Amino acid sequence: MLKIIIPTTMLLPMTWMSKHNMIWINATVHSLLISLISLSLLNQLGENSLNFSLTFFSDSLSAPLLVLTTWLLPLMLMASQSHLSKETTTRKKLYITMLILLQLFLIMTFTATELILFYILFEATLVPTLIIITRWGNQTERLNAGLYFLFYTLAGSLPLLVALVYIQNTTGSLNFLIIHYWSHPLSNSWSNIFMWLACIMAFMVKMPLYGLHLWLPKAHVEAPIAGSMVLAAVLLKLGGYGMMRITTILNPLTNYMAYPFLMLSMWGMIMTSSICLRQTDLKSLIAYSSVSHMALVIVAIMIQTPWSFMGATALMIAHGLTSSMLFCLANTNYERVHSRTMILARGLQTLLPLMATWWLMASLTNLALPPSINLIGELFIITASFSWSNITIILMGMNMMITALYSLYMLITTQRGKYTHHINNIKASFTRENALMALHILPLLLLTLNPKMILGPLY
Amino acid sequence: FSTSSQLGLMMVTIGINQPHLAFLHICMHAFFKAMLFMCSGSIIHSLNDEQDIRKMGGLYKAMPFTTTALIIGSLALTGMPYLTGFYSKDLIIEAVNMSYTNAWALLMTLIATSLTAAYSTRIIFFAFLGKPRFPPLVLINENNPLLINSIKRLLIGSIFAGFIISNNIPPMTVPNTTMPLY
């Protein structure tokens, strides 16, 4: 795995020692090359994971996530170039180093073989994210949002740390391979119930769960564009990966313990999409959409069936790409008009047609138009839920309808109608912005052709 | 609304467990309904984006070709014998009558056929018949080769495709050979 890790580390000295003019260029070139290197990991043996060394291993679950992270860094750099132009060279380098440290921590999380190392780096990801939000946010609420995000995640994680140490003391190892191979069943006891809660709750906080999702809207609305990109694309999927890995230990008790979280997610997706129908802030709308999709993923994980897991992985990747692109599209309009209110900017299709096309494609993927990987994941989750219970289809279909409604409603309000007369600062979309939207879209449409890459290990 | 009613007739045909007849009705409806809508578009474009029948009148002679096309389309829609509608709708009704059926469904289908004739009469009477009611400036001009040829093809289709297709397709339903004259 060091083929990816060490160049990522070397990105930091290169960024620090590069000339003030060339920081973005050098970062982008080498991050794209690192992603090209990371593309090799997609080749996974069907029976067994790629165990590179004692510390690091990769499977068909970790590889798409690593590729997503490595692809996401250059996109974040392109998006964050514009609003950081006025910043001094040291501050821009510090921002880039926070991004690089975040990518490094995420790669090591997805590849770590030991649950305690996974926890250490998965909690380490908070520090760069918190610094980004609280230092380069543009509103006074960034401090409150950072506090909420940090404290929600830590309150979830600390019991996970205690439980992981207890597992190390009892079973004797936290290596995922050994745990999977030994994996003695749990018993229905209050001690085991609370171990299950401790293991599950940290990831349930990371994957915005209804009632634990309050941090996500504040964080995504208040963060800068790059921070929103990582939060939507990878930081939420950290919870999904953790839950999928950790579900091996808690085999039987999952059936009893899933019902609260299952019902919470199943109702919360409807509630959050209904919230999306009435949101007045574009970033907030996208955030609640992310909450709904992640609730679907939570349902898929809790069901613990092969089709559910495949759909969960597909939805994770597809949603990461779609949400990152949607945040980028919203950020462009925010830079142009300096407000996030949906109603303020109207009829932008006449002013910016290619951006309107990007918005159309992004919304179509968001509403899971086939054969998008979004729909592949969602449909697999729906079929798994139907096997779990035929009555799930009512809630799943209602959620799909509302997702279509709010996606096309955002598209209609922002990009259709009469142009706002008084706004005169709209200017032709830069090649950077269109390039960013294309870099988001083209991989997503391409992955439809070969879907086995993002269908996970159980494929 | 005519399209919706015809779709409902197709759904009824499916209910009577006669699927191939419903497919045939779809095939014929495509022709005659698309032609009717093209005629409507010609009327609208001629009258400067006017769609209200109340503001349209006396177009029988003003637009001869669109008038002929719409008359033929309405006759096909209403089931005029040996037109496209006859090969589909007449068989639909005959199968509906000669089958185990919900009584109210059959009654509603017959009433709906009456109303199809009714609204065909409405469009023809208000639009083409009578005295002109459109604004003074007369810009009527259907002498456009694209419009004329496009309507021509669907006219020929509405007239003969029903017979051609019905003869060529293999028999897929046991016919209702004998039935009371009424």
Partner: protein, 128 residues
Amino acid sequence: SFPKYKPSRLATLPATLDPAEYDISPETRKAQAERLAIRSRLKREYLLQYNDPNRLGVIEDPALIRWTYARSANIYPNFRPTPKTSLLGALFGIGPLFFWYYVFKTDRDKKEKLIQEGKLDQTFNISY
């Protein structure tokens, strides 16, 4: 005496059928004049900013900012736990959760009972 038009929440009473439009007083006309004055002042300010050849950017409407803040920020500080607020929150928050728990739990238990009794058909159900 034609049948009267019952106004509703989704069918507002027309101004033409407004019983108050035909009962006008000098003070009502004064109030209308004042409202017209307010609208005229606002329109004047907006048009002054809108026709300015020097202006480049949005004309920040305070009303829109107030609307957004009231819809998002001002809610919690101006919230008080009251019997209506508490009861509606309890109902619309947890009641649906328990309703779906009941429905799905009963369904799952019925399915498991049928499976244990061997009285369920899964002849080709080999993809779960």
